[PDB]
Amino acid sequence: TWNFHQYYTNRNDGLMGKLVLTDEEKNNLKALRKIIRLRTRDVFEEAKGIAKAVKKSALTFEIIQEKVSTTQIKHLSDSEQREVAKLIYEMDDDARDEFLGLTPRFWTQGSFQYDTLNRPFQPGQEMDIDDGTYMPMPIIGHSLLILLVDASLKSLVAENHGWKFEAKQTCGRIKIEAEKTHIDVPMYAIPKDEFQKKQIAELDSENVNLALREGDRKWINSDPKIVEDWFNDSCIRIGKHLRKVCRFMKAWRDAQWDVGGPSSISLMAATVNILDSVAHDASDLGETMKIIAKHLPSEFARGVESPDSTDEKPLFPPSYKHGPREMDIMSKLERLPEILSSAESADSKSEALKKINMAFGNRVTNSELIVLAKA
Numbered sequence: 001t002w003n004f005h006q007y008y009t010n011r012n013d014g015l016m017g018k019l020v021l022t023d024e025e026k027n028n029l030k031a032l033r034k035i036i037r038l039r040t041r042d043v044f045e046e047a048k049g050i051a052k053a054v055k056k057s058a059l060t061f062e063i064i065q066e067k068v069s070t071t072q073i074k075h076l077s078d079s080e081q082r083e084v085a086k087l088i089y090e091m092d093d094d095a096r097d098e099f100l101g102l103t104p105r106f107w108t109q110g111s112f113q114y115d116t117l118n119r120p121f122q123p124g125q126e127m128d129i130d131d132g133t134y135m136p137m138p139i140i141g142h143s144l145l146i147l148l149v150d151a152s153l154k155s156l157v158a159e160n161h162g163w164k165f166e167a168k169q170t171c172g173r174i175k176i177e178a179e180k181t182h183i184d185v186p187m188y189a190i191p192k193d194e195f196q197k198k199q200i201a202e203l204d205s206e207n208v209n210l211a212l213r214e215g216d217r218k219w220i221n222s223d224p225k226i227v228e229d230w231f232n233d234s235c236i237r238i239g240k241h242l243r244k245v246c247r248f249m250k251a252w253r254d255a256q257w258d259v260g261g262p263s264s265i266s267l268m269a270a271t272v273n274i275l276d277s278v279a280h281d282a283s284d285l286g287e288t289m290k291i292i293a294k295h296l297p298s299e300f301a302r303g304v305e306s307p308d309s310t311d312e313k314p315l316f317p318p319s320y321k322h323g324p325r326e327m328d329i330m331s332k333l334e335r336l337p338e339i340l341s342s343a344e345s346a347d348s349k350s351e352a353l354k355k356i357n358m359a360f361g362n363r364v365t366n367s368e369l370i371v372l373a374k375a
């Protein structure tokens with residue numbers, strides 16, 4: 001019978017040592033995010049410069065266009081530039097007024113904010129950085145904001161070799177395969193007055209709207225602060241070990257799937273439900289990971305519901321809604337406890353390391369992190 005606590009938690013050779021990024025990596029991602037923010041704000045200032053020239057000495061559309069083709073918005077297709085120029089021209093005094101006072105704001109979400117960003121494992125796997133841009137509007141164009149953020153990202157891509165722009169449904173994305181990193185930029189709309197009033201010092205989820213790229217619906221009520229709050233709360237409530245086991249389950253997914261698998265947020269939600277309803281010992285994360293693995297299939301089978309009550313879709317669908325994908329996820333889920341149990345009862349440290357590395361991959365190599373269990 002073996003103990004795997006050091007295998008999991010050691011910050012040098014242990015799994016945690018292999019997943020957490022160094023302060024340098026962490027700062028390179030902050031620098032990249034700062035770059036994206038600066039360019040977004042700059043492109044908005046250029047566009048607003050044009051619009052301000054429109055409010056002032058009213059100019060012709062063909063002139064507006066000529067000015068637009070000189071700003072970083074020149075990194076859009078000639079048709080998109082046409083769209084931008086148009087929307088800026090067709091603007092009424094009011095919309096233009098509101099627009100000239102709009103300055104985009106930013107707030108990061110996902111792993112990087114939760115502090116659960118794992119070093120990518122298999123080739124193709126990358127670091128996900130979601131940095132949302134919030135537009136303080138009342139209650140302006142959807143297309144105009146989408147085009148301005150798009151123009152910011154494409155303008156940054158036109159400056160760097162190996163960078164790519166991908167237009168996804170809930171965001172515009174910048175990929176950097178060579179650096180194994182990618183940054184999504186979802187756009188939200190928030191109430192202006194409440195934003196200013198709170199600034200002179202939390203908004204209301206009911207008024208935080210996520211813009212959708214295509215479809216009949218161009219906005220949906222979605223606040224990331226809900227999930228962030230929920231996880232932070234669950235972290236204080238459960239303990240410092242929740243983030244660790246969440247990182248471990250995510251690493252497990254990253255090791256069992258080169259691409260795909262259950263979302264990290266479903267694994268997190270389930271893991272928190274388990275740690276909330278089952279007794280465990282934080283001074284032994286191997287035992288805890290065994291409990292978690294043991295209760296995960298039963299959690300994913302019943303279905304995992306988002307900690308956001310406004311979310312109508314679940315993080316993971318229940319059993320009677322499972323297709324090949326969810327059945328595959330249930331296959332691996334049900335295969336993990338057998339691996340931890342097998343590894344626990346190995347015949348040597350090296351074989352225990354071999355068996356336990358069947359779940360998280362060959363990342364931990366030091367077999368001395370595994371030790372005999374005390375009576």
Ligand SMILES: [Mg+2]
Pocket residue numbers: 110128129130184
């Ligand atoms: Mg993302």
